[PDB]
Design a protein around this ligand. Sequence first.
Ligand SMILES: Nc1nc2c(ncn2[C@@H]2O[C@H](COP(=O)(O)OP(=O)(O)O)[C@@H](O)[C@H]2O)c(=O)[nH]1
Ligand SMILES: [Mg+2]
Length: 410
Amino acid sequence: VKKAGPVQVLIVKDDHSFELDETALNRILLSEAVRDKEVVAVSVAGAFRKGKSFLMDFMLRYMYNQESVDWVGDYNEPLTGFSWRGGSERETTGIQIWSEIFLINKPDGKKVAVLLMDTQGTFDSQSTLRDSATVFALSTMISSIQVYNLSQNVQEDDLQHLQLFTEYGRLAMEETFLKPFQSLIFLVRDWSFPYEFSYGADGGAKFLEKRLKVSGNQHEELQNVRKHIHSCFTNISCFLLPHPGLKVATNPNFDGKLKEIDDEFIKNLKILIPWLLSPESLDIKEINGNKITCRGLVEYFKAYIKIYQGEELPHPKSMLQATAEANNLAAVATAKDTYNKKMEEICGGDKPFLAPNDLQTKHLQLKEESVKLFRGVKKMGGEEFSRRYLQQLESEIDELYIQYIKHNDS
Ligand SMILES: Nc1nc2c(ncn2[C@@H]2O[C@H](COP(=O)(O)OP(=O)(O)O)[C@@H](O)[C@H]2O)c(=O)[nH]1
Ligand SMILES: [Mg+2]
């Protein structure tokens, strides 16, 4: 009673709560016509306004029209037909699936159910990071190709976010000799240095090599991005997509003829889409080595959500917070150290059991000297932030002093 279209299946409300739409999820992947078929699950995932819907709009044009030279459409007429682009576009965090599941014939002769999802999150604060990261983990767990839609390059935060949500994924799942996830494509959206690396998969491949080999190693432990990434996915690639031109770029709801999109962009879109979605390359989802059915998929999805709802996912700590904290603990540690070294320098060892009166005055002297030491030193927090650490130093020195009176009363 309604055309085919995009439907919200997972959303994160202001409550920071994850709202799963069971009946919507059921009505779509528990249709008898599909419920028992092996499912290929393709996901485009990224921040808001990164061009995902536009890309998936062409994906639909292909999925609906397996015919030569039309799948892209008529060079002289606008884009038309089914669309993920809804108009009054709210920024939201979650997953949309295309309501129409496609049945497609493989080279083997299998009839697979092809599932298309949009995976979206916002990254504007350490609070929304947690939510996006768990929405991206769920997406990647439930999909067989995760096309990670990035904008100009692969920035440090892009990789950090990728590790963080694969990390979240690993938590909710039991470890095996197999890799936790299948495919991952770094899709770079507005590549503008073709003279360095080419538009496309050849060129992308090369670029991702250089990027991953830097950092290089990070972050601090020997958990460097390349190893981490490669140990999570079975296949990793990267496509370099050109800029679509100013009309597409500055026009929300673009609606001009195909001809007004940049020619190099259409040309590469023409190879990218089938590169991902052609019957040959279509790739059946599997978990623990076993191919999944649309129904199987639904049960894992409900299941995975259950787990994350039960236990708490680690809250991310920002770089600025982390490095400030560290800078202050070092001040704290330096000052404690100096206090301690001098306290045994003075009072052993038992040395001369000292009048609790005399030991105390040596303690106050030394505490003051190391508290004075604790200020004067450059610290990132700002006074209000470092005050807490100053308490820390006093709290700890006192405790380190209580031990020193025992050793003395001997
Ligand atoms: N610069 C650039 N803009 C794009 C691209 N694809 C779409 N756009 C435009 O960017 C805006 C956001 O597009 P949209 O697909 O709705 O972004 P989404 O929220 O990630 O789905 C729209 O004006 C699009 O016409 C692209 O590859 N590069
Ligand atoms: Mg969108």
